[model samples]
Target: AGQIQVLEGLEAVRKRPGMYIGSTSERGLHHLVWEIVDNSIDEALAGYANQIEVVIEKDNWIKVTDNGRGIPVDIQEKMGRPAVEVILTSSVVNALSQDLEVYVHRNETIYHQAYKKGVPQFDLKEVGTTDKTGTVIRFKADGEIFTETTVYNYETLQQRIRELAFLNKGIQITLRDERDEENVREDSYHYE
Candidate 1:
């Protein structure tokens, strides 16, 4: 009997990023942020989130924070891993990132996980406690993959986030560039 072998998680995405993200050019580079941001937007659409923040950190790393119900941490029946792990491991954004970190605040506790090229560094751990529920995702674009450029354009991100705020209606979306410590720039949008 011939058996089909499934490609391991994210291997295909890393091998052919263009197929997943359209191109390896600057447009594709910016698309990474949208991939992650869209998930938060979904949460807002479901009435679980009211705010989303995008930060362009030093060294071009992007941090997206959403005040949404954190990803479920329960064990997944089939994968035998935490639901959060399954969700992230299967994400195109995580697969394309050189390094990624997640902090999930839920159940009055904070859970943490770090990954390199979509592979988990270790089992998710309970890092601390929190009164709020949300998810924070920080990732650095993979230089090896996004060879054209890893830097992000603030105006590009700002304009789109402003549009997202308008479309979502009532969800606050903010874009902040902290790459330059001296001249930090920020733009926030909210629509009634």
Candidate 2:
């Protein structure tokens, strides 16, 4: 039998994002956005950064920014790419978009059981940091994910992230779509 080549880590995904993400189509493209979000989350979890802003820019660019430490910009000789860029494109982050409100109530039936039962609680860890002002991640999303994209699914994405912020207990996550013609909202749910 011929020897098979092993494509280590995410080298394969970067080459064919389609195979890794189900379809190398639109949703597959959005998988790229999910990557940066996770880094922001880890920082926020580590008590370093809070207040993350995600902007779907005019072009196909998606920007994820944070008020915590930024990703390192030093050269990574291993991959010959900026450490920041490597981490951002590493295909480590991406998953789920079910919008549901999750509140932070004192340990109750389910949560208390989960917590006391050692069912794995929410914990955030620090991935990496840099000497820049907070973390700003801006990248041009693949021209695919937006195929059926109109206005971003704000309610869905925001609710999901809002719950994450509460579970982490301090991280502030904000989602803004420039598609909004005006600043209009009926009521805002403020969690503090």
Candidate 3:
């Protein structure tokens, strides 16, 4: 995994194989979930968002939903390209060896893009109109890097999210589990 796989002609690197950010490096684990979670919180703090929802899909893909100001669909100042496209390069891809689909709702439009293994499978296209403004970050963990067992630590994540709820009194964050129907957990939090 030391070899960086050039995805879609973009400067990208694959799993650093033995790169140990923590104790769970042997098997590719997702500790980067917090980054996006924190990002959702960030949006709320900026007063662009008020609600957030995180869904852990059966395939371990995570979809973070926020009714906040979505990524700008305008031009990027530095790259001279769409800011949303550059947004993908900054946060999602750098976190894990995962595919990401961004559904950005802004100005009554939804901008969507899908990527595989840090490679843009397609260009950013305007999907349709939305009455809302928010961002949906759907992350598909790479099979090459993570096994089926490589999943987000539910309790650990829940603790942090719950803590965020307590710390931020007006924002609401919901965590849902779709892996097991019998033991499904759909919890929402907003302190005060």
Tens digit per residue, CA lDDT, model 3, 73-141: 798566665787766665533445567888999999989988766566777899999899999988866
lDDT of 1 by residue, 1-192 (tens): 100111265788999999999998899999999999999999999999999999999999999999999999998777778999889988888889999999999999999999988888899999899999999999999999999999999888988899899899999999999999999998989998
Off by over 4 Å in 2: 1-11, 24-30, 89-132, 144-151, 180-190
Q: In model 2, what is the error at residue 178, expressed in angstroms?
A: 1.1
Candidate 2 collision pairs:
18-24, 26-145
Error of 3 at 154 (Å): 2.4
Q: Which candidate is the best by TM-score?
A: 1
Q: State the lDDT at 34 in candidate 3.
A: 68
Mark the 10 consecutive residues where model 2 has the least summed lDDT. Answer: 109-118
The RMSD (Cα, Å) of candidate 2 is 14.3
Q: lDDT value for candidate 3?
A: 0.72
Residue 47 C-alpha lDDT in model 2: 81
TM agreement with the true structure for every prediction: 0.96, 0.57, 0.82
lDDT of candidates 1 onward, in order: 0.91, 0.46, 0.72
Off by over 4 Å in 3: 1-28, 92-95
Cα error, residue 94 of model 3, in Å, equals 5.2
